[PDB]
């Protein structure tokens, strides 16, 4: 319907795509680095989610330049996506309040 709802939907789909690609790319970037732990896909996908939500427990993280670059993309995609949802909620509340005031 409205632009904000559409944008929020698209952002969520975009995020899921970034989570999957980031998981795949993180493993590709980290294998070959002695000591790295972000090296199998199941846990890499878990890592991508706790990174996108900015929780970052510290159980897993990248040690290489390219793994870190991948991490930044996931971080920004998560922060932006969740932020966009907040903006969509605000727009919805603002429209409803204008109606309620009879504006």
């Amino acid at each position: 319907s409205a632009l904000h709802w559409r944008a929020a939907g698209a952002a969520t789909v975009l995020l899921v795509i970034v989570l999957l690609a980031g998981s795949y790319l993180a493993v590709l970037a980290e294998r070959g680095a002695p000591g790295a732990q972000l090296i199998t896909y199941p846990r890499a996908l878990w890592w991508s989610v706790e990174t996108a939500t900015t929780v970052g427990y510290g159980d897993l993280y990248p040690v290489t330049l390219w793994g870190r670059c991948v991490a930044v993309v996931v971080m920004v995609a998560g922060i932006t996506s969740f932020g966009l949802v907040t903006a969509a909620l605000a727009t919805w509340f603002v429209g409803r309040e204008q109606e309620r005031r009879g504006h």
Epitope: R31, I39, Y41
Partner: antibody, heavy 118, light 108 residues
């Protein structure tokens, strides 16, 4: 059916090189990695390296002298290992194994016995 | 690189008795340990994954346990076909590494 097919043997003259092959069957995923393991007679298993066919990137064991170069042919679903300038120290059984990106070697090839002799 | 220590190198047991193989990691690796069986002239065969997960087609007398640095592969009532070399392998940190292996011998 046999998931990984490797030739039974290869005779190599000292100083020369050889190209081992590992043909894969069964399910193939973008997350699959093909590994190579070396086993000298009477000795244990030694990891040589790995390659991800979907991207073509390979990594190698840093603890040993690099004698191998890994490549893969996506169309023929075959992984290759080029061993160069071999010595008698390189005589052994070389296995290829498939890992689904989750850390363990689910299936192994029969192994190729490489003998370095004149 | 993670060092996996398997000791003793040879384990002797009487037929039907329970036996346990030891694998110790140089640092804590959760449950990222896998076990393989290799008979004379054969290729390694996956027995247990992630320390204790059973694999389809593997006899029920095989089980694994442990976490952190100490792991164990156990065989309930060992039999002739169990005669082989057993290796542990870790996938917690790059690169993957193998233990030196332990041989099982039966006293008949």
């Amino acid at each position: 059916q046999v998931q990984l097919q490797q030739p039974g043997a290869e005779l190599v003259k000292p100083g020369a090189s050889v190209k081992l092959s590992c043909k894969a069957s069964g399910y193939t995923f973008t997350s699959d990695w093909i590994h190579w393991v070396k086993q000298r007679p009477g000795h244990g298993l030694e990891w040589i390296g790995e390659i991800i066919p979907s991207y073509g990137r390979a990594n190698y064991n840093e603890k040993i002298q690099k004698k191998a170069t890994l490549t893969a042919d996506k169309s023929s679903s075959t992984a290759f290992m080029q061993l160069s300038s071999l010595t008698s120290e390189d005589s052994a059984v070389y296995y290829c194994a498939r890992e689904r990106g989750d850390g363990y070697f689910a299936v192994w090839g029969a192994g190729t016995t490489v003998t370095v002799s004149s | 690189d993670i060092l996996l220590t398997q000791s003793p190198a040879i384990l002797s047991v009487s037929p039907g008795e329970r036996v346990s193989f030891s694998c110790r990691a140089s640092q804590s690796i959760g449950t990222d340990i896998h076990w393989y069986q290799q008979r004379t002239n054969g290729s390694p065969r996956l027995l247990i994954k992630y320390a204790s997960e059973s694999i389809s087609g593997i006899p029920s007398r095989f089980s694994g346990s442990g976490s952190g640095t100490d792991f164990t592969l156990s065989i309930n009532s060992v039999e002739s076909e169990d005669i082989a070399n057993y290796y542990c392998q870790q996938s917690n940190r790059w690169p993957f590494t193998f233990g030196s292996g332990t041989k099982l011998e039966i006293k008949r």
